[PDB]
Amino acid sequence: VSMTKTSVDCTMYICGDSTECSNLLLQYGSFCTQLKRALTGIAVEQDKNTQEVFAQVKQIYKTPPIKYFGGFNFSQILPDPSKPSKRSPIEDLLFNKVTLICAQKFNGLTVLPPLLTDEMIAQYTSALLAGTITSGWTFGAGPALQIPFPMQMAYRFNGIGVTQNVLYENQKLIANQFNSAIGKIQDSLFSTPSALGKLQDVVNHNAQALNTLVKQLSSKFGAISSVLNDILSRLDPPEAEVQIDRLITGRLQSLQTYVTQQLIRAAEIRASANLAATKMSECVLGQSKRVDFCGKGYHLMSFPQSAPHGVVFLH
Amino acid sequence: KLIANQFNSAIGKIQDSLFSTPSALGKLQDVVNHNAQALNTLVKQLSSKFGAISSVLNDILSRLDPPEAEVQIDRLITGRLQSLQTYVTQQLIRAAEIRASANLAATKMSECVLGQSKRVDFCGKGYHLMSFPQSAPHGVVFLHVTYVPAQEKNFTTAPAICHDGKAHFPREGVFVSNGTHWFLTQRNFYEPQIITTDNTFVSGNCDVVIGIVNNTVYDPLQLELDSFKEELD
Amino acid sequence: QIITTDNTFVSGNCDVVIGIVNNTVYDPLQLELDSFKEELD
Amino acid sequence: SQSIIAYTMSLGAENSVAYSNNSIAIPTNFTISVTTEILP
Ligand SMILES: *[C@@H]1O[C@H](CO)[C@@H](O[C@@H]2O[C@H](CO)[C@@H](O[C@@H]3O[C@H](CO)[C@@H](O)[C@H](O)[C@@H]3O)[C@H](O)[C@H]2NC(C)=O)[C@H](O)[C@H]1NC(C)=O
Ligand SMILES: *[C@@H]1O[C@H](CO)[C@@H](O[C@@H]2O[C@H](CO)[C@@H](O[C@@H]3O[C@H](CO)[C@@H](O)[C@H](O)[C@@H]3O)[C@H](O)[C@H]2NC(C)=O)[C@H](O)[C@H]1NC(C)=O
Ligand SMILES: *[C@@H]1O[C@H](CO)[C@@H](O[C@@H]2O[C@H](CO)[C@@H](O[C@@H]3O[C@H](CO)[C@@H](O)[C@H](O)[C@@H]3O)[C@H](O)[C@H]2NC(C)=O)[C@H](O)[C@H]1NC(C)=O
Ligand SMILES: *[C@@H]1O[C@H](CO)[C@@H](O[C@@H]2O[C@H](CO)[C@@H](O)[C@H](O)[C@H]2NC(C)=O)[C@H](O)[C@H]1NC(C)=O
Ligand SMILES: *[C@@H]1O[C@H](CO)[C@@H](O[C@@H]2O[C@H](CO)[C@@H](O)[C@H](O)[C@H]2NC(C)=O)[C@H](O)[C@H]1NC(C)=O
Ligand SMILES: *[C@@H]1O[C@H](CO)[C@@H](O[C@@H]2O[C@H](CO)[C@@H](O)[C@H](O)[C@H]2NC(C)=O)[C@H](O)[C@H]1NC(C)=O
Ligand SMILES: *[C@@H]1O[C@H](CO)[C@@H](O)[C@H](O)[C@H]1NC(C)=O
Ligand SMILES: *[C@@H]1O[C@H](CO)[C@@H](O)[C@H](O)[C@H]1NC(C)=O
Ligand SMILES: *[C@@H]1O[C@H](CO)[C@@H](O)[C@H](O)[C@H]1NC(C)=O
């Protein structure tokens, strides 16, 4: 759903604490401004993506204190009030699997926090779960109208060409199969390290992009040295300007490459977030007839779960 | 009449909302502003020297002989070519974003305007009824007409009615009670009806469904029969 | 198809719907009843 | 008077739904709503 929000001090990356370099940098025009706007736009877009995927509910819905829904056990998807952060067992597992002093990459590169905290995302997920569980499909379309859960499921069965009496006669079987499947979801995610690979890949790509951008500072690009302090310490301005312009060219090209690839990744993340928001509206806030859109089989219902930089749907 | 009046009021509200809210069309103004920025930046970059003695080629050629001018010109060529490459790359990225938006707009035109969609929140908030396109500079504005439930009432329900050893289920609706009598209603609009053998279907006995309640299910044919030969002879 | 009580449903009286027209709606059960005891005795 | 304040943002109003084994809410009225979607 979202990407790490970065910010780059162009002058401090290219010309860190060097007035002579900064003055030479001024002769290239407004490149630092274009890069700054591009990264700001990406940073704003990531919060827009999170807001569009999770902030789809007008109100924060709560479940009853008596968590009995016809025999359907939702305790592994609903928030656990005992633990701090009020996340569900599955959400805690999802957050545990994916991994203010600027200790690393202190070369003008900073990371901005998201506008919504993990707790706020968990609160939106909890509201969505409470709405679907207690109000069915009416929650998404307007006011939340309470319906007994087994009758919500019977309606959802009618939605797939199965009569209501099939569910009522087999209600215990359906509840047991549901509870078993949820336990299987927890075992699958717990025991399979690769299950959340898409989100770890997003984290790894952002980590690579920043590690590469910082490592490029050590390159000489034809200069006598990669360190501006050594060039200014050793040479007079007229020779230093040549060595500095070689370093400026190399660092500016490195920043242009970084920003271009962040824009491409931002577009990919935006497309993913738009898909996630569409699925949230069509799978969680309703019942979908689109084949394989909301899981394998005939769709009955979906439940969102928060994950680092993303969303996990249980179909 | 109520539906027509609510529609007409909502349309007037659309005009007042767009007229009085300058930010309502921000997405299209943002596209215009981004293209204006990209071109203003591309032109402004021509004034940069990029290490040259001057940003103007006429002054370099007026002042220097070809062999020195070639060096100053190559500094300016490098700077201008990189500026053009940056502009074109960002236009390609913006073009991809606009293409995705246009594809979404075309999908919405086909599914919201040329039909009726069951995709939740695809064609506006509420249950979709219809949509109307409007042209806008560099874009499209869709007016989405939806049905929004209102004034819900709190009723007692049951999954089935037990009549004489048989479980009766709604064919198209939900069973409700006002506290004294059971009725069958449609789910999205309260309209109580008598529970009959035409409104419901029978499957199984009364000992299987959890939460089944006892109520009379009326059969028209039996009632007519019980009147038809009442005299007997 | 012939308009009957099986093809249609009834809700409200005739004074509410705008553009309602007058036509016979056929009920099979009444017709059979009107033939079933036609002799009477 | 007026000043700039900082606060933790609200996510929405709270709504405790009266869920029960045998309770259903059913609309007795409706609203026709017109909304606007703008796309480049
Ligand atoms: C809904 O399901 C949950 C579990 O799926 C029920 O709660 C309890 O869950 C734990 C595991 O989370 C079950 O195993 C226990 O694990 C602990 C681990 O330390 C162990 O010490 C215990 O001896 C036990 O093995 C536990 O059995 C389960 N509770 C019961 C009564 O089975 C929850 O009760 C379910 N809700 C409903 C309404 O049935
Ligand atoms: C439709 O399929 C379900 C399974 O998805 C059938 O229910 C399953 O029935 C078997 C017996 O044939 C159950 O196994 C038994 O479970 C008890 C548990 O105490 C155990 O003591 C027995 O030794 C045996 O293992 C199985 O648990 C049960 N599964 C569920 C989820 O209820 C169902 O009967 C099938 N219906 C038809 C009409 O074929
Ligand atoms: C369902 O809701 C609609 C509103 O969306 C109800 O219609 C509204 O009814 C009120 C009266 O209760 C009308 O207010 C009156 O309007 C006349 C106009 O001349 C005015 O003179 C009165 O003093 C009063 O203000 C309101 O205009 C009307 N709205 C519309 C759009 O017709 C409707 O009655 C509700 N139905 C049920 C069954 O609750
Ligand atoms: C539940 O609905 C029934 C049906 O309308 C109500 O009983 C009717 O009340 C009207 C009041 O004008 C009478 O004219 C009908 O003859 C009654 N019908 C029957 C079969 O009794 C009943 O009072 C309602 N109960 C509640 C609590 O609202
Ligand atoms: C619906 O009516 C049936 C009778 O037609 C009820 O069944 C009886 O319930 C009593 C409860 O004390 C038993 O003692 C009888 O033996 C039952 N008779 C039969 C034939 O089953 C049934 O309990 C009623 N259901 C409800 C919810 O009131
Ligand atoms: C449908 O038939 C009814 C009669 O069954 C018509 O109602 C009559 O209309 C005339 C019009 O001049 C009135 O004078 C009568 O008093 C009405 N009688 C009743 C009982 O309403 C009705 O107008 C017919 N509709 C159409 C469209 O022809
Ligand atoms: C600021 O420093 C103090 C100690 O000097 C520490 O207790 C506090 O947590 C720090 N705040 C942040 C945001 O790091
Ligand atoms: C619905 O009615 C029951 C009593 O039959 C009541 O306890 C419940 O609070 C009502 N629902 C609401 C939302 O007030
Ligand atoms: C629904 O029925 C179960 C039956 O065990 C009961 O425990 C639960 O409290 C009931 N729910 C409500 C809201 O009364």
Author numbering:
A (entry chain C): 729 to 827, 849 to 1064
B (entry chain A): 921 to 1153
C (entry chain B): 1113 to 1153
D (entry chain A): 689 to 728
What does the paper say about this structure?
The JN.1-sublineage KP.3.1.1 recently emerged as the globally prevalent SARS-CoV-2 variant, demonstrating increased infectivity and antibody escape. We investigate how mutations and a deletion in the KP.3.1.1 spike protein (S) affect hACE2 binding and antibody escape. The spike proteins exhibited three conformational states: “one RBD up,” “all RBD down,” and “flexible” (i.e., one or two RBDs disordered in the density maps due to flexibility).
JN.1.11 is JN.1 plus V1104L, and JN.1.11.1 is JN.1.11 plus F456L. Prior studies also indicated that the JN.1 spike protein exhibited either a “one RBD up” or “all RBD down” conformation. Using 3D variability analysis, we quantified the particle proportion for each conformational state and found that S31Δ did not affect the proportions of “one RBD up” and “all RBD down” particles by comparing the proportion of JN.1.11 and other spike proteins that have S31Δ. Besides, while F456L alone did not affect hACE2 binding (JN.1.11.1 has F456L compared to JN.1.11), Q493E alone substantially reduced binding affinity, which is also consistent with prior research and is likely due to the electrostatic repulsion between hACE2-E35 and RBD-E49317. Additionally, S31Δ did not markedly affect the thermostability of the spike protein compared to JN1.11, JN1.11.1, and engineered variants, as assessed by nano differential scanning fluorimetry, but retained a substantially increased melting temperature (Tm) over the SARS-CoV-2 wild type (WT) (Wuhan-Hu-1; GenBank: QHD43416.1) (Tm of 46° C vs. 32° C). In addition, other spike mutants with Q493E retain BD55-1205 binding, while F456L resulted in a binding affinity decrease where the only mutation of JN.1.11.1 is F456L compared to JN.1.11.
